[PDB]
Design a protein around this nucleic acid. Sequence first.
DNA 1: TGTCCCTTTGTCTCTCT
DNA 2: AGAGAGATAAAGGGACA
Length: 491
Amino acid sequence: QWSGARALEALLTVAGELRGPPLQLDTGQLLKIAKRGGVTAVEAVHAWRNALTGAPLNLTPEQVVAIASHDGGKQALETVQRLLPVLCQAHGLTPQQVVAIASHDGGKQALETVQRLLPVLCQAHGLTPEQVVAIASHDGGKQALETVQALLPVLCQAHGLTPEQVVAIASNGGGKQALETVQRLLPVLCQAHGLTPQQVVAIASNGGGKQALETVQRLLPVLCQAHGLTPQQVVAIASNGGGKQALETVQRLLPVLCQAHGLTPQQVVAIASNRGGKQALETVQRLLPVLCQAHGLTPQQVVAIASNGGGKQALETVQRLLPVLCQAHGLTPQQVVAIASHDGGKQALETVQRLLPVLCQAHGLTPEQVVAIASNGGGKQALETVQRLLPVLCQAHGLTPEQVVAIASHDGGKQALETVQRLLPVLCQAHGLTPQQVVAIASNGGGRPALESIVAQLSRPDPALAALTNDHLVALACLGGRPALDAVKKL
DNA sequence: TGTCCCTTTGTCTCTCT
DNA sequence: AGAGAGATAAAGGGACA
Ligand SMILES: [Mg+2]
């Protein structure tokens, strides 16, 4: 017979007993745990399902799932029940912070290292506990913490990095490798190539890590001589999303794209410069002539779809759904291009196809409103929240559908809608803001933390804002959100 | 196999002018 | 607002006992 047959059975046997109390996990949850944490993780959840739910820890099932769904999830669960009260009472961490640290592969290692190193990192090195939590909250957190402890002096002193930059480099997966590589390659990339320490930090952080830095070192000349790129444009490729893979693939595909399709290097860099750039470039070389045939899409439209994180997925989804959305939903190609030209375009596209008729018929929105909501990053999230929350926001809070669509139509619209739902009563009833003022604050990117900042100030007034009226705070929040408020706090 | 650590890619949210 | 930066997740490889 088959090996895993015994294992899979034990899996299902215990998995079915977890749909009961006190956890009640759905199929999705149960699979996710099975997939990343394994059988033993599923058993551990079961075996420790009462100790984690109730007194003292009182963790949500969602939080138990978060901790369980990684390699060694069994170990993280055991370690959490042991160290969560230690870390909260002895180091002043929130339980949310502890879960954050535990919710990665090798979670046990990270928790124990935090317990062992947070004192010395704050006292001897002057890091905040927040910074320590951030370093610890990725796979290999233990390694990143040990490496920060060890190289913070030499990085700040012999290499001129601020502690902030060091923390920023460290707070990624492979943090250890990024730090060690930055130590070695900073002088090389600085003195030999005219990059600033800042630019090096950017290559090292955000995923690029060691591979991006070594690939910038290796390939920067081959790119700025023959291919005639600026260092600026090389840094941009390696920086965000990037990195190594995008850089290697820009060498391969820069001519093929220009020569045969007539894209500028400018356009190529923009496609290159996201997470999965390599994938994006490739799908473009492959798919562009297919999208622009039969008087179809324009090059510039193909370039714009491609130039966001997951561009490959948006491209393939566009190629696949362009017909059905135009034919059976009445959308113009231009609209479809707008929906797709943001991070997660694939998701927004699929969610528009799925929910446009529902939001139109059941909720009385226009197709234009649905497109506008979809045409932002996280478009799927905003669309699903509008569907869920429109009736309550309108019926229970007095908002117009127009107002709800306005809150929804920015990056993080989901967060903004959920927060207006939470805080509208206390802002208006308890502090006398008008609904329109609330809607205004919330109708920007970052509407959620703008709203929270406002509530903080009116419920636990910082003296440093008291010279401003509600109306002035409101104007400030609309103008530049939380950052503006916090910047005022400093004055 | 279970665990730890690293890399790539995709998605979502917020910032900075 | 449009571009950059930061957060978080998902999934696979290497390594080791
Ligand atoms: Mg982008």
